[PDB]
Amino acid sequence: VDISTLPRVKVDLVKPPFVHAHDQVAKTGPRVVEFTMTIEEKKLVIDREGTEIHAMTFNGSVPGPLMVVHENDYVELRLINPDTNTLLHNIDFHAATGALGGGALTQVNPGEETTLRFKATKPGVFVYHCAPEGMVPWHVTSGMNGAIMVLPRDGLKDEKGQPLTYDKIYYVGEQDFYVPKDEAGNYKKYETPGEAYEDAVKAMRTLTPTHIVFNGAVGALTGDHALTAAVGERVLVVHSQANRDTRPHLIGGHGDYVWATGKFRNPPDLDQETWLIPGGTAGAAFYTFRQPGVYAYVNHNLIEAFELGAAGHFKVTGEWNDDLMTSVVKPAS
Amino acid sequence: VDISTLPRVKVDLVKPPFVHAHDQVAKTGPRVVEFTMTIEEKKLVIDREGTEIHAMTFNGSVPGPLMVVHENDYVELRLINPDTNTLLHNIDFHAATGALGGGALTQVNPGEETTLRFKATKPGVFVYHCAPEGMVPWHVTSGMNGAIMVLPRDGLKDEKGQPLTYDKIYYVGEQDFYVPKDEAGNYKKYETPGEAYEDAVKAMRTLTPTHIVFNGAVGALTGDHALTAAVGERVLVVHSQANRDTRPHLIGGHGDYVWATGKFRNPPDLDQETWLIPGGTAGAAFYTFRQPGVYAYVNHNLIEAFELGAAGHFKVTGEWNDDLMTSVVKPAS
Amino acid sequence: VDISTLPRVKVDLVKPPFVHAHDQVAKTGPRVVEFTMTIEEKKLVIDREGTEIHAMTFNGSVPGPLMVVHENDYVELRLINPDTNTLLHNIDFHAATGALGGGALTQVNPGEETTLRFKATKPGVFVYHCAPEGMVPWHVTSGMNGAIMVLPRDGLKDEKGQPLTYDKIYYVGEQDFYVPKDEAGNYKKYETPGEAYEDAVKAMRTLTPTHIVFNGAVGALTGDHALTAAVGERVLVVHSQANRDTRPHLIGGHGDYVWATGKFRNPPDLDQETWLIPGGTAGAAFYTFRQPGVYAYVNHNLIEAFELGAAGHFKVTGEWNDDLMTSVVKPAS
Numbered sequence: 001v002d003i004s005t006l007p008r009v010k011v012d013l014v015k016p017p018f019v020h021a022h023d024q025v026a027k028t029g030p031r032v033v034e035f036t037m038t039i040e041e042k043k044l045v046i047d048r049e050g051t052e053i054h055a056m057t058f059n060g061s062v063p064g065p066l067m068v069v070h071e072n073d074y075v076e077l078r079l080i081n082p083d084t085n086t087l088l089h090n091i092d093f094h095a096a097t098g099a100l101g102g103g104a105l106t107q108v109n110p111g112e113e114t115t116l117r118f119k120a121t122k123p124g125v126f127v128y129h130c131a132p133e134g135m136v137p138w139h140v141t142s143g144m145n146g147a148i149m150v151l152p153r154d155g156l157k158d159e160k161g162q163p164l165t166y167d168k169i170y171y172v173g174e175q176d177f178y179v180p181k182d183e184a185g186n187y188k189k190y191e192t193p194g195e196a197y198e199d200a201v202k203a204m205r206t207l208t209p210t211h212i213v214f215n216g217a218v219g220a221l222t223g224d225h226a227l228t229a230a231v232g233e234r235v236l237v238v239h240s241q242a243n244r245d246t247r248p249h250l251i252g253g254h255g256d257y258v259w260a261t262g263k264f265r266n267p268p269d270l271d272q273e274t275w276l277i278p279g280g281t282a283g284a285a286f287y288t289f290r291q292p293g294v295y296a297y298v299n300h301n302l303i304e305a306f307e308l309g310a311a312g313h314f315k316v317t318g319e320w321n322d323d324l325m326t327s328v329v330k331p332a333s
Numbered sequence: 334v335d336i337s338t339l340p341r342v343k344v345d346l347v348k349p350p351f352v353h354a355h356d357q358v359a360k361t362g363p364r365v366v367e368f369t370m371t372i373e374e375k376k377l378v379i380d381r382e383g384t385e386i387h388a389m390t391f392n393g394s395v396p397g398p399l400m401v402v403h404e405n406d407y408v409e410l411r412l413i414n415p416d417t418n419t420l421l422h423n424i425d426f427h428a429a430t431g432a433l434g435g436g437a438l439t440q441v442n443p444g445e446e447t448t449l450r451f452k453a454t455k456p457g458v459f460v461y462h463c464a465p466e467g468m469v470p471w472h473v474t475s476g477m478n479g480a481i482m483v484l485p486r487d488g489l490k491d492e493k494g495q496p497l498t499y500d501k502i503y504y505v506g507e508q509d510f511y512v513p514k515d516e517a518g519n520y521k522k523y524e525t526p527g528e529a530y531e532d533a534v535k536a537m538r539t540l541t542p543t544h545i546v547f548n549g550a551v552g553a554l555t556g557d558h559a560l561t562a563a564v565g566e567r568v569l570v571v572h573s574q575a576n577r578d579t580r581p582h583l584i585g586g587h588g589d590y591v592w593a594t595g596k597f598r599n600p601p602d603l604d605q606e607t608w609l610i611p612g613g614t615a616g617a618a619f620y621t622f623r624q625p626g627v628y629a630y631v632n633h634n635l636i637e638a639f640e641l642g643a644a645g646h647f648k649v650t651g652e653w654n655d656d657l658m659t660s661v662v663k664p665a666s
Numbered sequence: 667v668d669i670s671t672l673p674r675v676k677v678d679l680v681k682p683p684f685v686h687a688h689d690q691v692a693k694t695g696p697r698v699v700e701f702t703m704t705i706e707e708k709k710l711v712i713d714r715e716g717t718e719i720h721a722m723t724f725n726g727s728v729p730g731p732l733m734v735v736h737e738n739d740y741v742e743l744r745l746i747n748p749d750t751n752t753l754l755h756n757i758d759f760h761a762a763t764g765a766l767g768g769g770a771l772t773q774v775n776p777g778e779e780t781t782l783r784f785k786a787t788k789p790g791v792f793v794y795h796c797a798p799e800g801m802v803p804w805h806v807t808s809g810m811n812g813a814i815m816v817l818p819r820d821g822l823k824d825e826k827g828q829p830l831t832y833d834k835i836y837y838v839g840e841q842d843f844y845v846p847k848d849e850a851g852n853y854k855k856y857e858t859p860g861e862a863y864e865d866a867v868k869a870m871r872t873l874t875p876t877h878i879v880f881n882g883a884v885g886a887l888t889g890d891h892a893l894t895a896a897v898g899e900r901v902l903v904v905h906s907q908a909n910r911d912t913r914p915h916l917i918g919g920h921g922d923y924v925w926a927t928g929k930f931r932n933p934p935d936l937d938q939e940t941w942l943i944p945g946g947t948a949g950a951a952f953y954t955f956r957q958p959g960v961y962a963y964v965n966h967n968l969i970e971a972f973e974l975g976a977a978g979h980f981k982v983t984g985e986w987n988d989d990l991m992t993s994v995v996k997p998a999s
């Protein structure tokens with residue numbers, strides 16, 4: 001087909017955990033969906049102690065923004081590497097077919113840009129990440145990863161073929177960082193990326209993250225940046241991990257319908273407490289809130305959650321249901 | 334509904350790996366099922382070397398006992414923290430909805446008790462664990478976790494909707510411990526829980542368990558405490574891991590029907606060799622024994638099994654089937 | 667039945683990643699399928715640095731060869747331990763039922779052989795591995811493992827019950843090695859297996875592989891030993907990991923149909939980006955190539971892939987499809 005005959009629609013991305021506006025059920029035929037991202041190398045403070053790293057980002061955030069299209073749309077990405085950056089970058093879409101997911105076609109030095117197009121032939125949530133030959137895990141584990149959602153044209157379906165429609169969506173990107181340590185255990189700091197590279201490699205080879213965070217930092221999805229919902233609302237939480245396994249859990253809730261490995265032609269798993277998202281994958285969980293209050297959303301390696309950073313909060317408004325749960329006798333001597 | 338109009342039934346729990354008597358198919362309407370557990374902080378010897386830790390238990394065991402109810406029963410738990418203990422505790426049920434699984438409503442100092450009720454709205458096996466704010470992974474990885482089984486009212490079903498009925502059930506709780514080590518690698522010992530806390534946190538942050546055990550100790554499910562079955566018997570093995578992934582395997586057998594992430598509205602996976610139970614989850618495997626003899630039941634990271642403790646035995650009685658397996662020529666020069 | 671009345675067929679095995687000739691749909695009734703393997707202890711160079719270990723192999727390779735039979739065939743294995751070896755060995759088939767998978771019946775000292783027969787009652791891909799009592803993880807993590815495929819008699823089926831027929835098959839065995847290190851981090855070398863055993867145990871107990879490789883060495887499945895396919899070809903990739911989780915990914919492709927835990931009575935997962943194969947399991951992924959060029963096949967812990975060795979290549983011939991992917995604007999200032 002002549003792609004030039006198709007509609008074009010430009011998306012304006014938003015910072016995670018929010019997601020750009022879209023339609024669950026496609027209201028048009030196939031489109032070329034136009035995205036732009038600008039790579040930004042920047043310093044980021046990732047914990048309460050003030051540890052500062054040299055992060056590598058798509059669009060200034062860890063994770064990069066969630067892109068949303070429908071099955072058999074074309075994704076057309078303008079990828080910009082400004083001359084204020086110092087490294088070579090590219091992009092690999094797990095949603096795409098060919099050329100190492102696009103990485104072989106999108107190598108951009110500082111001061112260059114490129115435009116890639118691919119057909120989104122499979123529905124699901126997928127990781128995208130930078131992948132420069134020879135330096136792949138360093139870029140990924142410096143924050144250079146995000147996700148793309150390819151919705152079925154008729155939206156999501158349950159295990160029986162009935163519609164599932166979310167009221168809200170959030171994107172939680174989980175990042176393992178490997179901050180080099182000296183013998184005594186304190187983090188080391190580096191003057192340039194080249195001077196850091198060997199100790200970055202050493203640190204990665206321990207297979208032991210120093211930090212595991214949501215939305216780029218310890219506590220990022222707490223306090224005034226907690227996730228929010230109301231009792232009765234249907235929420236989809238997209239979760240990605242580009243490099244290492246995770247096991248999400250909503251403390252006080254469930255995954256009512258979960259695609260743990262993220263691919264919508266498969267029936268969802270029902271009533272999950274915890275789900276495994278393998279490293280290199282995006283997954284999605286659908287839940288209808290039934291109680292108000294604070295929930296924690298965690299990686300249920302609780303060490304990873306509460307000691308290394310992989311924990312966020314929901315604040316949920318509405319009525320308490322004492323049939324579902326109540327304190328019969330409050331704590332007392 | 335007025336819960337006060339429902340039948341009440343008191344359960345008397347038993348020590349793992351055994352399970353209190355119950356009905357697979359519900360013989361009554363919905364009930365309030367009454368449980369009591371008493372928290373016990375105690376010293377436990379966990380390996381053959383004599384390493385002794387300060388364990389934190391529900392009902393004196395690691396894991397805590399398996400609770401069994403049916404879908405849409407109410408679970409009413411009296412949780413007692415005697416004044417002989419020294420720490421604050423609570424309980425989070427992954428089966429429950431709201432208040433951080435019950436943890437926000439069940440904080441008990443030594444000398445206090447509380448009673449929680451929740452509706453068991455989803456069928457499956459689920460983890461429960463202590464979760465005191467700020468100290469969650471330390472309590473969990475000190476042994477303070479167990480599981481609850483919420484059976485469908487019409488019992489278990491295979492992938493075709495046909496009944497599956499077990500003859501025996503066992504509960505295997507798998508515990509990762511993080512015993513602090515000095516520089517030379519020997520375990521450190523501590524005078525009080527507060528003096529131990531920072532090195533406990535340090536030890537956990539390595540993400541490398543020193544011990545991974547079934548039923549609280551190396552070898553606990555061997556010798557006179559081996560699991561038992563007969564050829565032809567249908568056995569359900571419930572397995573939980575509150576904090577870290579595991580991959581159970583019956584050496585010499587299979588999981589004929591497995592709910593690896595534990596939730597019975599989903600069809601089981603058939604004919605598994607090994608299954609992944611993510612940290613924070615309970616799973617269940619159904620097997621019909623076909624050969625007698627010794628079987629090993631293991632986490633199939635074989636280092637975790639045979640060097641760190643995650644191995645137990647079945648002793649199975651009955652006839653040998655030479656059609657299924659035989660030595661044609663015994664080992665010989 | 668009198669097994670002596672059944673046809674016998676002798677298989678001549680081939681070195682991974684290739685697979686001996688077989689039929690997907692069984693062209694005969696049930697057979698006794700005869701295999702022979704000779705154990706070989708040998709030195710192997712496993713990385714580009716020249717690190718040499720004392721490997722323990724079935725048939726001289728890491729992994730051991732893929733065996734292929736059909737459901738309800740009998741597997742009859744002659745296992746030979748020549749007197750040029752120094753250790754005791756045996757074999758455990760995860761496909762088999764009884765006697766610890768055969769290990770209790772196949773203990774062979776150097777200079778001995780044995781013949782085991784078992785009925786392959788369950789279809790799927792399964793691990794096999796050595797398992798000498800007391801020394802199990804050392805033999806497995808020295809390379810002594812492979813896989814067996816038990817095909818359904820009517821071949822593979824998709825999620826709808828329609829045939830899936832592969833044009834090519836490859837077997838990727840992934841091996842975690844634990845090469846002991848001194849305090850400074852250099853590999854230690856040993857004079858005899860007994861002198862190595864305690865430091866091998868110490869190294870394993872860190873749960874941190876020094877090397878994670880495909881087909882026995884860093885780079886083994888690259889260059890002149892890259893995997894090959896053509897656009898339009900249907901390829902099945904069998905992947906096993908006898909001891910540790912992995913998460914395969916075809917960079918630039920997908921798993922169109924995946925049995926992540928390897929058992930063919932279950933419907934496959936569709937359109938996977940990445941899949942989790944738990945330690946102790948074999949899995950299988952089916953893909954139809956749609957684009958030519960180089961693909962990387964990796965464990966998508968990218969540190970494990972690109973820094974520790976768990977990466978191979980496909981070279982795919984044929985036409986480029988610009989509808990599926992194209993560079994709209996090549997990288998430029």
Ligand SMILES: O=N[O-]
Pocket residue numbers: 249250251252302425434464469
């Ligand atoms: O479910 N809470 O750790």
Ligand SMILES: O=N[O-]
Pocket residue numbers: 582583584585635758767797802
């Ligand atoms: O299956 N045994 O390690």
Ligand SMILES: O=N[O-]
Pocket residue numbers: 092101131136915916917918968
């Ligand atoms: O998908 N590549 O790392």
Ligand SMILES: [Cu+2]
Pocket residue numbers: 056088089090130131132139144
């Ligand atoms: Cu980059």
Ligand SMILES: [Cu+2]
Pocket residue numbers: 389421422423463464465472477
């Ligand atoms: Cu506690």
Ligand SMILES: [Cu+2]
Pocket residue numbers: 722754755756796797798805810
């Ligand atoms: Cu061996």
